[PDB]
């Protein structure tokens, strides 16, 4: 009846799928073999005698991260052909990752995305977790989004794209890969959400106070984001928010579909039992500019939509009371054509803390996804970094001789500047 299909590409997508399904297995009672000792129907499918089976595809052209998953603890949970492996790495190359080396794996991926979404009608939507700075995260992510758009055009296309930070970029050709990826992220992706690494790096550094955090702790925080995302879809609540509600309440123009994210409270056991984490004390920290998960400073931007989702034993009395003081403070500001900007969802079931992680057992939590004019800044320094290094033909021969042509860079430059002219056109 009701189901949602997650799609992960790249090494970053694979381990971001490992965190969000270490969590979803831990809350639904799913052992690593799938045996329970009807709310599971979105992420797990009933197969045989009490076994619940993952609803995804794991995609990576290099085997080095995916075949170590199929030798792991979650190896009798996952179907073998949902984890699809290539033979060679895309190697930070949009030309190979889209044209040359990524064409013999799409025919298996579209076979499995058909075999997974045809078991029941009323599919709720597709989620996408791609690495923008990666090779197969940008190249293979672009082409299969293109093929799922021609096949299933009238279904939701969520995306949590992990963007390179202004200073943390861990490679050299992130100007080419990200600008080429956002040419098609603009055109056939219904929802885009930026997950910048350094922003979540800082959040673990001061809130959870881990000054040697690793990609594991980065991945748990995204798992909490997607858990309180689809909490209203899986469990009941005082006020439901559907995935269809997202685009109708956060996207006023089809070109502008790039929003933000924030999770609060992210307190640590030690700091946990020390604050009454109330439906307000936690929604003020959710709107704090430094609590951002993509380091887009919103004090020089105008909020154009915001969606808040509460998760726990939340009364809506102080939901409305705390969101009023959000509306009255002048350090926040809304663009005048949206006098209201707030869509609320309420889920009764509290979030579940993972043992040995870095959060604590918190009764109530907030996840907030806001569209703003302050997306123009993450693309504005993207303009600076791309032109500064495209100027004298750096790394161009890895793209020209490997499938694309000289001029794809000019139009990918042009339509991002068209996105900037469109964003400042909203910004009056």
């Amino acid at each position: 009846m009701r189901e949602v299909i997650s799609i992960h590409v790249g090494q970053a997508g694979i381990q971001i799928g490992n965190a969000c399904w270490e969590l979803f297995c831990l809350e639904h009672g799913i052992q690593p073999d799938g045996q329970m000792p009807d709310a599971f129907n979105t992420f797990f499918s009933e197969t045989g005698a009490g076994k619940h089976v993952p609803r995804c595809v794991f995609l990576d052209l290099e085997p080095t991260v995916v075949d170590e998953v199929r030798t792991g603890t979650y190896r009798h949970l996952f179907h073998p052909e949902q984890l699809i492996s290539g033979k060679e790495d895309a190697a930070n190359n949009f030309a190979r990752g889209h044209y040359t080396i990524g064409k013999e794996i799409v025919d298996l991926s579209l076979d499995r995305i058909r075999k997974l979404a045809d078991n029941c009608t009323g599919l709720q939507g597709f989620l996408m977790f791609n690495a923008v700075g990666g090779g197969t995260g940008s190249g293979l992510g672009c082409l299969l989004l293109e093929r799922l758009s021609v096949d299933y055009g009238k279904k939701s296309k969520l995306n949590f794209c992990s963007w390179p930070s202004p200073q943390v970029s861990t490679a050299v050709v992130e100007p080419y890969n990200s600008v080429l990826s956002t040419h098609s992220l603009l055109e056939h992706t219904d929802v885009a959400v930026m997950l910048d690494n350094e922003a979540i790096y800082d959040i673990c550094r001061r809130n959870l106070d881990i000054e040697r955090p690793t990609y594991t702790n980065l991945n748990r925080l995204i798992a909490q984001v997607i858990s309180s995302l689809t909490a209203s879809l899986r469990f009941d609540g005082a006020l439901n928010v559907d995935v269809t509600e997202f685009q109708t309440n956060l996207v006023p123009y089809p070109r502008i579909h790039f929003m933000l994210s924030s999770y609060a409270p992210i307190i640590s056991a030690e700091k946990a039992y020390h604050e009454q984490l109330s439906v307000a004390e936690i929604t003020n920290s959710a709107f704090e500019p430094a609590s951002m998960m993509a380091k887009c400073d919103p004090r020089h931007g105008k909020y154009m939509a915001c969606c808040l989702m509460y998760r726990g034993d939340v009364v809506p009395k102080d939901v409305n009371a705390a969101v009023a003081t959000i509306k009255t403070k002048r350090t926040i500001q809304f663009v005048d054509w949206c006098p209201t900007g707030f869509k609320c969802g309420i889920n009764y079931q509290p979030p579940t803390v993972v043992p040995g992680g870095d959060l604590a057992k918190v009764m109530r939590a907030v996840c907030m996804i806001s569209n703003s004019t302050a997306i123009a800044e993450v693309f504005s320094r993207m303009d600076h970094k791309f032109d500064l290094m495209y100027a004298k033909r750096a790394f161009v021969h890895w793209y020209v001789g490997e499938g694309m042509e000289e001029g794809e860079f000019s139009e990918a430059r042009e339509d991002l500047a068209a996105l900037e002219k469109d964003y400042e056109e909203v910004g009056i």
Partner: protein, 201 residues
Amino acid sequence: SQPVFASPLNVEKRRLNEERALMQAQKANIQLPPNYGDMDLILFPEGSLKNSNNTVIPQSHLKGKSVALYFADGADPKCASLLPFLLNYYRTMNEGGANQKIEIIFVSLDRDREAFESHRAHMPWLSIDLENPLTEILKRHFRVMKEYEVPTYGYGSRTGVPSVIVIGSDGREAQFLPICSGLEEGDRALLRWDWRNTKFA
């Protein structure tokens, strides 16, 4: 069976606990071998624990206390650095309250007899002596090895000495305090021992 399958404590846990399952099945539909959460063992025998006054306490005294093991070695410089701050965190936690909160049981990675009494004279919490086989089956269960001399069954060393392991009534790995791990949070990892939640019960 948790966190490991190849440990002497847990293979003796399995042997004992489906032993009486066959016995009550012959006495009597029962599901055999029994499930992991249905499995219940004894973790410390009658004459194992030993407080500072050299008298013995059974395991029943620790119920309602957040107990944690403590693997330490006298000659190791890291262990001699963790010992004062572990003593201070054991001190100010329980003094500043109206209820005993935390408890520490000491497991030894020390060479021989006379060196153990010198190290054991410094801490005020519980301890287990070397010649007891319970120490041998404990660090082969939580995989706390300073070096690979005992053949470990496909694993690696889970952590280096020193380490504190928050345990449960079923030998459960409740949380790990990262002294020597991927976090490598020396001297401060202690400020993360959730005294609540974890409660040997």
